């Protein structure tokens, strides 16, 4: 395995580990508040990050690197729905920047299989960004109280 | 059967008999107002207290005590949705306080089967407290009118 | 919206149902405790039937814009053995039916025909309970107490 | 594994071994006499004691103790139905006293899983005591001859 | 019922009671060690002995004897698989010797039904001897480590 | 919500978060090596810890504490099967010690629902300790090469 | 169709033709030795190379090139399991080297559909490399004789 590919893959892994925990706690906060539709959506977002972490771990091991599950960076935890959505969005904008940097390097060293894994993760993160921007926009269009009302029941 | 255990069990049963009637009336009031989702939920809370009452009666009889279904304490009847939910919450905080006291005494006299029964009731009353706190929080987050609207239809 | 005295009558019938619910639920669990499971099961169904009658009275009182009274619980008639328990249920039902007839009279007088119909349905069911109770007491005499109890051991 | 917990568990195991044999014999005596409903019921009680003994043996071995299946205490065999039911009841009153002492001890040394195993056995033995006292009461209520009649057919 | 027949049936029954407990403990020992295939087979041998005991108890009662479930002989408990297997084998060789003597005596006094019962028990114990000798032979042919490995999984 | 209960629950949650990542990495290491039976079992151990962590987060929120998903303690990563099993066992021994201390405190302040939650986690960790010790015992009884051989296929 | 793209595709097709025959012969050698699990796995590796050749042949025709099925390079045939696995691995390392050079060129001349086809082949060859290095590592971990024993049966 190329050394900087492994480094990049461990950096993406690191970002996924932050997002697993952030989304899981956000899901459980939403469920606690009785906003069960947000909580369920955010739970599935956490599970998707878990699956990506799994694929990254497996690839790092095949390339004979050491997956780093020890370093957990800063969780962005909001205190209300609007903040939590914006925190998830801030995290995803950092995650896609790093994914693009990793894909650029993979292409340069001809690691096309790693590039393809990272591109699939990127597509999934951009769909999350689409979801988050749509939610923030809906809060503006229907108002916050209606937007929360619409997320009470699954 | 330990005399004080029978006394605590009859105290818990007295609490259940209040909650049966309070929840049933609150249920039928919400149904009458067309808030059928609140009515259905509160109906199931009444049924669950009927089941706990039944388990308490069976245990008191096995311990050779006299179940007391004669003394009905004070019902806390609200006159609107907010008051009714806070009356249920006030009832449950007293119920759990008495359950903790019954559990301590069961342990002290080695009545572990009565303790286990009481702990199962306690877990179910904590779940009701959780629901009730959540509803009061949703009234604040979505507004009362939206909250009621969301409880019109089952 | 409703007639005030109709509501008072319906709250009085409701009060009788709330006694019956508790009395029959306790008798049922006493019979189960003693191993007389067929009696226990029948009495449990009588208790459930009174619960449903109470539900219909509560719903009708609310519709009529009265306040259902679930706070006042009158005197439970609890027996010490099977024969007393059956007589206690019978004593309760005889009072219940007297009050039903008085409430039906009043509904009729003020033209509350839907309330009268609800109360007649309750009365039919309570008379069926009286038939059951009188029949059991008669069977205790015909087959003897020990055989009667024996026949109610198994469901 | 706590040495005194293991001694308590072997003590309870010893009682179960007595009960297995006592109830199995009582079952086959009732079947021999044609009281097939008593015989079937007592067979199931014996089977339940066999399952408790299994769980005790598995727990003792996990705690690194030696399960004692060698010491068989005194079986209380009756000569007729009324004595047999009282022998079973005498055995269970001794059995539940030992269980309560064992639970106290497991609780103090923080062996909460052992305590939970013993609590499940205790609930089962209290159910047996309920059955036993109910049968003795029924003999008084319906008369011995009717009582036995009712236990001829399964 | 012939007095010595009944003595022989209580002797065989006494042997069954030892085997029940020995095999049951050996089963749970094997399970505790993760040799689940040995544990499962030895559990089924214990159950088989339980069923023989039941048939003996029933026959003793019909003959108007007193089944003796009080006297529990010495359990032969091994410390490892080879010893446990040899212990079972030693117990069975004693059991079949006793069964042959009982059959001789039943034939002598013309209790042909008891003889037939004992013969069916004998056939089953000889099948257990077959299994045990085959296992000890396999340890020799495949080696102990392989033999144990082959009994890890059910 | 009692402040020290919440501290205990967050300490147990910290333990779960370590175990999730340690077991997940060990699972994927074993899969990478072709020891797919070990990899599958360790995956399920990790998912089980994830589920425990979920329940802790929900209880901490209901008690109006802040769940700590930010602090990740030291993963104990082995470099061969024997060491990985021992690292799992060391983690589980610390985990159960902390569970017992939390259960004591819950009992002390009468938080019987938290204690019940903790006791179910404790039973699950003790089953894991049972598995781990059995595996280490098997390596000694069948030899390391046979033990690994038996864990190649699912 | 770009002339050098066609030449690269014909080079990869040449590598697939070697792999087809080498893996097929290895498969039947393993079957002949009674190592049916290896022979079954290697048969499926051969089929996969057959399917890759088919996709290459189709793409070359579409680009108006001449598929070259005439030139068969050097088969690497081993004479025991360890050698056959290392021969497969040597062939795959060469194959993946050529695939990367082919993809680089497709990207330069903007033949993204050919690049897509080769990247899919490349991922499949890296999975085969994963398998081969895993098998070689298992031979070391469980020993040759156990490794081969584990591959006698399908
Ligand atoms: C105001 C007093 C009560 C009312 C209005 C009431 C009402 C009801 C109703 C409407 C049902 C559903 C029955 C059906 O449709 O099958 C029910 C069920 C039941 N009730 Fe009550 N009830 C009352 C008091 C009690 C009390 C004091 C007990 C004592 C244990 C009790 C025990 C039960 C039980 C065990 C069931 C069956 C629940 C189940 O397992 O699904 N009820 N009740
Ligand atoms: C007098 C001695 C015993 C007798 C006569 C006896 C009899 C029986 C019988 C007749 C069965 C049902 C077998 C079948 O048809 O499947 C059985 C099952 C069983 N026995 Fe025993 N048994 C004895 C002692 C024991 C002992 C000491 C243990 C130790 C645990 C034990 C454990 C079990 C278990 C676990 C079952 C399966 C129960 C189930 O899950 O259905 N038995 N026994
Ligand atoms: C706070 C940490 C985590 C929590 C609370 C958590 C929680 C969960 C839960 C509740 C499930 C569903 C389990 C079920 O009911 O079957 C799950 C699934 C899963 N988790 Fe995690 N998890 C966490 C961390 C991780 C990490 C770090 C990874 C991988 C590196 C991971 C990988 C997975 C995988 C692969 C699944 C199965 C997903 C699927 O295919 O459905 N999880 N997790
Ligand atoms: K009779
Ligand atoms: K082997």
Curated annotation (Swiss-Prot), chains A, B, D, E, F, G:
Ferritin-like diiron domain sequence ranges: 1-143
What GO terms in the biological process aspect are recorded for it? Answer: intracellular iron ion homeostasis; iron ion transport
Q: List the subcellular locations.
A: Cytoplasm
Q: Which cofactor does it need?
A: heme b
- Effects seen without this gene: No growth phenotype in iron-sufficient conditions, cells do not store detectable iron under any conditions tested, cells secrete less pyoverdin siderophore and deplete iron from the medium slowly. Very low amounts of FtnA-only BFR complexes accumulate in vivo at low O(2) levels.
What does the UniProt induction comment state? 24-fold increase in transcription in response to iron treatment.
Recount the biotech application. Small molecules designed to bind BfrB at the Bfd binding site (derivatives of 4-aminoisoindoline-1,3-dione) cause cell death in model biofilms, and are bacteriostatic in planktonic cells, suggesting these compounds are potential antibiotics. Model biofilms were tested in strains PAO1, PA_1081725 and PA_1076058.
Which positions does UniProt annotate for Fe(2+) Fe1 binding? 16, 49, 52, 125
* EC number(s) from the headed UniProt entry: 1.16.3.1
Superkingdom, according to UniProt? Bacteria
Residues annotated as binding K(+): 146, 149
**Predominant cellular place of this UniProt entry's protein:** cytoplasm
Record's miscellaneous remark: The unstable catalytic diiron-binding site within each subunit (Fe1 and Fe2, ferroxidase center) also serves as a pore for iron uptake; the ferroxidase center is labile. In the iron-loaded BRF crystal structure additional stably-bound iron ions are seen inside close to the ferroxidase pore. Mutagenesis of residues reveals other stably bound Fe cations in the interior of the BFR shell; they may represent a pathway followed by Fe(3+) to the central iron storage core.
- Membership in a protein family: Belongs to the bacterioferritin family.
Name of the protein in its database record: Bacterioferritin BfrB
Gene field: bfrB
